[PDB]
Write a protein that binds this ligand. Structure first.
Ligand code: CLA
Ligand code: CLA
Ligand code: CLA
Ligand code: CLA
Ligand code: CLA
Ligand code: CLA
Ligand code: CLA
Ligand SMILES: CCCCCCCCCCCCCCCC(=O)OC[C@H](CO[C@@H]1O[C@H](CS(=O)(=O)O)[C@@H](O)[C@H](O)[C@H]1O)OC(=O)CCCCCCCCCCCCCCC
Ligand SMILES: CC(=O)O[C@H]1CC(C)(C)C(=C=C/C(C)=C/C=C/C(C)=C/C=C/C=C(C)/C=C/C=C(\C)C(=O)C[C@@]23O[C@]2(C)C[C@@H](O)CC3(C)C)[C@](C)(O)C1
Ligand SMILES: CC1=C(/C=C/C(C)=C/C=C/C(C)=C/C=C/C=C(C)/C=C/C=C(C)/C=C/C2=C(C)CCCC2(C)C)C(C)(C)CCC1
Ligand SMILES: CC1=C(/C=C/C(C)=C/C=C/C(C)=C\C=C\C=C(C)\C=C\C=C(C)\C=C\C2=C(C)CCCC2(C)C)C(C)(C)CCC1
Lengths: 91, 177, 167, 92, 73, 210
């Protein structure tokens, strides 16, 4: 990737960042971002709790579909940050 | 704009039909990145011809030891007819002397490979070039394309052969055991 | 106005330009993300489901290759995996799928005028002109959607109860 | 063995001596700072630093007993810190 | 291909609100990709930290057989 | 070039003029208390003293740096702590009498130990309470970084919009109600922290019953 092939994303003067920083998610509405963030956080917390807390994680038997979904907690964080960004962008 | 081999992908920018066997087949873009780097495709084309010729020779010499025969057997009686076992069964004398023969050939080739000869044609080492004197340039292109296609086929064939002998121990339509 | 949901209007991106455009997008997913990727994904799912449906139906109505295990299509996956042919087909489709990585990149970047779900397979020039292309694309996408739903029903019925071509 | 983590069962090891030293050290620093503030206003600050005006220096040493309140008052009044662009700084 | 990230874009748009960290990380991509000494310094710092880590971890968690009783090594 | 003795380290054109502008004073906030100014001579009326109380001058610490919060933020935090402490002291007082919700097989709300009362509940029951508090404190908080640097524009300190219409239209009566809020909140803060201190170390609050 060359230095020229890069959009101007700097937003220090502005109060909020442009939607270009979201990449492919620039056009995603804020309501969809927020509701998906809530669903993702709930599902990931449920998966981690059922993997480690409710059942103590045994090496012989780990579900895998609970290991997946545990990654949605960072995804939920990103989704709610993007929800805020889209809310301030009015998009 | 579109490759002639893969008609749903863009033509490779480096390839432009100015080479033998050019059908725009470069999904990854080796020629493209080489041209961005600055080098030419002469090295890759000559390496292609080298590999194709070696694969053709290897394919014939691997279907042979057990087809028409393992020589008159002065010393090769002990060498196994299995090609993958014969390589670890050549004797020291023959092994080293084949080694030095191919070494001197490759060392002679290396200078014209990495030299700055402007008149050098890719795949033109002068070995058996006398037959090309009679033929015309269209015929020359056709014959070079035939050579390239045969080498291209043999590169993949051989590769199969080797694996079939490794995992099954025999080819399907020939070499029953 | 959206025809599927006549109580609201269709999004900006559903404009007829694409085949099978009934103005159906209650969630604005194709407004949220590029629609060419959506159409290519829809087409790919539909072709896989069409071939899967007809293959399931034939294997259940006796259609096997020489040197094949005579097994119902439900356990055909496991038996073919054990035989190893499954991995050969995996490589065969993986070649086309990596070429599809390249094709999708070119389509989205605009380096080529590639339509979604297009690999330039027209031996019989079935769509060499615009109106033929529109008609045949609408008919395909209809078949894609219908076979997607039909195969979901089939495989599930098969995994739930019974067997045979009917279920 | 002295335990210095914050537990009040062993306060006398570090916490009480710590506050005592902090008070004494702030006393010393405040006396020095206040004497410097005086000595600069004088006609000959350079000679006032090497020949101490003891009559007022003892006054500053005494008055520094209440330094935590005096320091807070000067901070609130903006007289503890010199602003940032009134102090030399080298070429960055 | 298209998927991925642009480090220039990431650095440029990572700037906290109200100019807490000045203009943020604008221009750092240019300086790092132009200056080999900054890259060398970052690599050396990371490798020194890694060397300290292996030194601290080999003795605490020996991985090779019978090395624990080999005191000189 | 502003109220602060130093220019903010935030740069020009990226926040400096936003931080270094004029800010409202402590005297323009409804927090004065007649009780402190309850002695012969100088004194106040209507429950308010003529001047506010700030021996440590935390209100005007912004002039030293913009790291320190503004009086808008401090009033927001004061009203938040007061409201939370009022609910907390009412809750402990009601719970210690033994009154509790009906309950069932799954949940048992019978526990007079306010310290360990949440521990008795199932994970879901207190989970809902904490989740509601987490969502609301976080949704209602918009423009709080603006109240820190001082821009009481978008957000008034303590005005979440919940029942703000019931405030009287007269300025005097509105300020009277706000002062009643602040006084009850501060009393509840002292009460709840005193009960907690009494629990942790006995004898901290001699008038305790819990
Ligand atoms: C409080 C700190 C903070 C804040 C406010 C932001 C804010 C921002 N970051 Mg982020 N970022 C942070 C910390 C922070 N970042 C850190 C610590 C890192 C280093 C890891 C990054 C790395 C990063 C990158 C690489 C990019 C951003 C970008 C963005 C923007 C998009 C946010 C978004 O929804 O993307 C997140 C959206 C998601 C859907 C979630 C992504 C996937 C999750 C986090 C992980 C999933 C699992 C993983 C892939 C696999 C397991 C291994 C936004 C301006 C984009 C930009 O333009 O930057 C200027 C961008 O491309 N950030
Ligand atoms: C904290 C770290 C971090 C952060 C902040 C981001 C942030 C982002 N990444 Mg990610 N990324 C990360 C780590 C991170 N990444 C890592 C470790 C990898 C390596 C695996 C990647 C690899 C990666 C790729 C290859 C791409 C991104 C892209 C993005 C953007 C996604 C926008 C979005 O969700 O739109 C809304 C989402 C959609 C419209 C699609 C949703 C499809 C389903 C729901 C995805 C589910 C995935 C999930 C993990 C499960 C966003 C700026 C994309 C981009 O455009 O970047 C500029 C992109 O192409 N990232
Ligand atoms: C291909 C690589 C590989 C292989 C062969 C194994 C094999 C094993 N692991 Mg696993 N493991 C791996 C990678 C791998 N691991 C990775 C990357 C991690 C994260 C650091 C772990 C962490 C881990 C832990 C903590 C434990 C095991 C254990 C096990 C055993 C049972 C696991 C099981 O039944 O999962 C079956 C699961 C599946 C068939 C589906 C898995 C699909 C995943 C979730 C896809 C997504 C991956 C993700 C993006 C990668 C980043 C990691 C992310 C989760 C943070 C087995 C010996 C257990 C063990 O041996 O205990 C004595 C055990 O306790 N593994
Ligand atoms: C043009 C080259 C070529 C040709 C003509 C063949 C031909 C054959 N291969 Mg294949 N094969 C090839 C390349 C080739 N192979 C390559 C490149 C590899 C390595 C990736 C293999 C690895 C391979 C294996 C491991 C096996 C075959 C087998 C076969 C036989 C059945 C498969 C089929 O449908 O055909 C057939 C004789 C099977 C065979 O010969 O069984 C005895 C078999 O088991 N092939
Ligand atoms: C996964 C398969 C798939 C995909 C990728 C698409 C994609 C598309 N369809 Mg849809 N479609 C599908 C299956 C699919 N369809 C099925 C089974 C039917 C029912 C027969 C339809 C019927 C249909 C109609 C009638 C129309 C479309 C249209 C569209 C486009 C816009 C709507 C949109 O948001 O897309 C869908 C976006 C997605 C992200 C797909 C997944 C959605 C959720 C997450 C799946 C789970 C829900 C449920 C449990 C199943 C888009 C190209 C419109 C069009 O042609 O516009 C140009 C249009 O008019 N579709
Ligand atoms: C390194 C980090 C760290 C820090 C910053 C503090 C800070 C503090 N600890 Mg300590 N503490 C630490 C680690 C630390 N602790 C560790 C690791 C332990 C476990 C052994 C303790 C165990 C401990 C106890 C048992 C007590 C403190 C207390 C205190 C406070 C002492 C106040 C005072 O005497 O004046 C203070 C807030 C006291 C406290 O809470 O006072 C209210 C107190 O009684 N600490
Ligand atoms: C933590 C809660 C809290 C907070 C944020 C505030 C905030 C405020 N009070 Mg205070 N106040 C409180 C508790 C609190 N109060 C309590 C419990 C009382 C005693 C009943 C009062 C009684 C009081 C009066 C009578 C007046 C104020 C006023 C003020 C304002 C100016 C002083 C200032 O800068 O305070 C900043 C506060 C802090 C930085 C808190 C620091 C606490 C330290 C660390 C000591 C803790 C000791 C601990 C409990 C033992 C400001 C809005 C004045 C006002 O509103 O004028 C318009 C005013 O007149 N307050
Ligand atoms: C949905 C999940 C992800 C969708 C794919 C994203 C994408 O296609 O890239 C978006 C960009 C195009 O938009 C690009 O958008 C970009 C805008 S900007 O530069 O970022 O501001 C820019 O690259 C350019 O304008 C444009 O081409 O590139 C492509 O679309 C082609 C890449 C797709 C094929 C490569 C990988 C295939 C998908 C990966 C697997 C996904 C994991 C599941
Ligand atoms: C002094 C001297 O000599 O001068 C020379 C000079 C000069 C110019 C060099 C000359 C020349 C020409 C030369 C050297 C010509 C050499 C030609 C040669 C030696 C050409 C082999 C091709 C082989 C191919 C394509 C193999 C395909 C192989 C394939 C596709 C397969 O069979 C596939 C398969 O096997 C698998 C993979 C697995 C099995 O289950 C199934 C089968 C069997 C089907 C001269 C003029 O003649 C003389
Ligand atoms: C001068 C200069 C330079 C240089 C620099 C350097 C040399 C640096 C270094 C640095 C360093 C060398 C650093 C380091 C750091 C570190 C850190 C920061 C760490 C962290 C950690 C953590 C975070 C951890 C955590 C954890 C975990 C994870 C687990 C366990 C527990 C704990 C907690 C421990 C350069 C070149 C750049 C250029 C410019 C200038
Ligand atoms: C408790 C405790 C602890 C802890 C501690 C800590 C954690 C601390 C911190 C600290 C800190 C973190 C601090 C900071 C600071 C800052 C600043 C910024 C300062 C300033 C100062 C000044 C400015 C001064 C001045 C003066 C005065 C006032 C007096 C004298 C003179 C002078 C001038 C010097 C421990 C564990 C150890 C244990 C023991 C106990």
């Amino acid at each position: 990737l060359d230095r020229s092939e890069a959009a101007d994303t700097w937003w220090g003067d502005k109060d909020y960042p442009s939607s270009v920083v979201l990449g492919i998610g620039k056009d995603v509405p804020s309501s969809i971002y927020g509701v998906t963030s809530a669903i993702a956080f709930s599902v990931g917390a449920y998966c981690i709790a059922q993997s480690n807390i409710i059942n103590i994680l045994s090496g012989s038997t780990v579900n895998g579909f609970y290991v997946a979904g545990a990654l949605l907690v960072p995804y939920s964080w990103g989704l709610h940050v993007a929800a805020w960004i889209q809310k301030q962008n009015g998009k | 704009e579109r490759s002639a081999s893969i008609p749903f992908l863009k033509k490779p920018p480096a390839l432009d039909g100015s080479m033998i066997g050019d059908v725009g087949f470069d999904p990854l873009g080796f020629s493209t990145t080489i041209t961005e780097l600055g080098g030419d495709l002469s090295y890759v084309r000559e390496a292609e011809l080298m590999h194709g010729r070696q694969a053709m020779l290897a394919a014939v010499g691997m279907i042979f030891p057990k087809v028409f025969g393992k020589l008159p057997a002065p010393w090769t009686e002990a060498v196994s007819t299995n090609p993958l076992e014969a390589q670890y069964q050549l004797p020291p004398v023959v092994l080293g002397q084949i080694l030095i023969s191919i070494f001197i050939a490759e060392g002679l080739r290396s200078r014209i490979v990495f030299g700055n000869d402007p008149n050098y044609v890719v795949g033109d080492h002068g070995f058996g070039s006398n037959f090309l004197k009679g033929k015309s340039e269209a015929q020359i292109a056709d014959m070079k394309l035939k050579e390239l296609n045969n080498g291209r086929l043999a590169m993949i064939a051989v590769t199969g052969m080797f694996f079939q002998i490794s995992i099954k121990g025999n080819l399907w339509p020939i070499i029953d055991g | 106005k959206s025809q599927a949901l006549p109580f609201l209007e269709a999004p900006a991106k559903l404009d007829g330009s694409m085949a099978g455009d009934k103005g159906f997008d209650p969630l604005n997913l194709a407004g949220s993300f590029d629609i060419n990727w959506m159409r290519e994904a829809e087409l790919k799912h539909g072709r896989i489901c069409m071939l899967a449906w007809v293959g399931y139906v034939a294997v259940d109505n006796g259609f096997y290759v020489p040197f094949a295990p005579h097994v119902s299509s439900l356990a055909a996956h496991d038996t073919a995996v054990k035989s190893g042919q499954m991995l050969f087909l995996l490589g065969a489709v993986g070649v086309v799928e990596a070429l599809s990585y390249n094709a999708i990149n070119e389509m989205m970047s605009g380096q080529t005028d590639r339509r979604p779900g297009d690999f330039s397979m027209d031996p019989f020039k079935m769509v060499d002109t615009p109106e033929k292309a529109k008609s045949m694309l609408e008919k395909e996408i209809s078949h894609c959607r219908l076979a997607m739903m039909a195969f979901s029903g089939v495989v599930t019925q098969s995994a739930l109860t019974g067997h045979g071509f009917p279920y | 063995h002295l335990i210095a983590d914050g537990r009040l069962d062993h306060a006398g090891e570090f916490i009480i001596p710590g506050f005592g030293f902090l008070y004494i050290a702030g006393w010393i620093g405040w006396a020095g700072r206040s004497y410097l503030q005086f000595s600069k206003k004088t006609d000959k600050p350079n000679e006032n630093e090497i020949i101490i005006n003891v009559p007022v220096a003892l006054g500053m040493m005494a008055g520094a007993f209440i330094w935590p309140l005096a320091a807070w008052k000067e901070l609130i009044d903006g007289k503890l810190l010199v602003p940032g662009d009134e102090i030399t700084v080298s070429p960055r | 291909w298209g998927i991925g990230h642009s480090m220039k874009e990431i650095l440029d748009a990572h700037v906290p609100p109200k100019g807490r960290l000045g203009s943020g990380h604008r221009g750092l991509f240019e300086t790092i990709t132009d200056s080999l000494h900054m890259q060398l310094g970052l690599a050396l710092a990371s490798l020194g930290v890694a060397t300290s880590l292996v030194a601290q971890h080999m003795y605490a968690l020996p991985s090779y057989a019978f090395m624990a009783k080999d005191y000189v090594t | 070039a502003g109220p602060m003795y130093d220019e903010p380290l935030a740069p020009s054109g990226m926040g400096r003029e936003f931080i270094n502008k004029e800010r409202a004073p402590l005297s323009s906030y409804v927090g004065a208390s007649q009780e402190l100014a309850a002695f012969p001579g100088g004194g106040g009326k209507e429950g308010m003293a003529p001047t506010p109380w700030d021996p440590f001058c935390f209100s005007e610490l912004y002039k030293v740096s913009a790291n320190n919060p503004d009086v808008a933020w401090l009033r927001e935090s004061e009203l938040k702590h007061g409201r939370m402490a009022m609910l907390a002291i009412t809750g402990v007082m009601v719970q210690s009498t033994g009154f509790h919700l009906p309950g069932n097989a799954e949940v048992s709300f019978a526990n007079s130990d306010w310290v360990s009362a949440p521990t008795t509940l199932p994970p879901v029951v207190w989970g809902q309470v904490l989740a509601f508090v987490a969502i609301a404190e976080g949704q209602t908080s918009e423009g709080l970084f603006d109240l820190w640097l001082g821009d009481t524009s978008k957000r008034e300190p303590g005005n979440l919009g919940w029942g703000s219409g019931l405030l009287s239209k007269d300025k005097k009566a509105a300020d009277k109600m706000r002062l009643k809020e602040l006084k009850n909140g501060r009393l509840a803060m002292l009460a709840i922290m005193g009960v907690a201190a009494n629990h942790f170390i006995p004898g901290a609050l001699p008038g305790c019953i819990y």
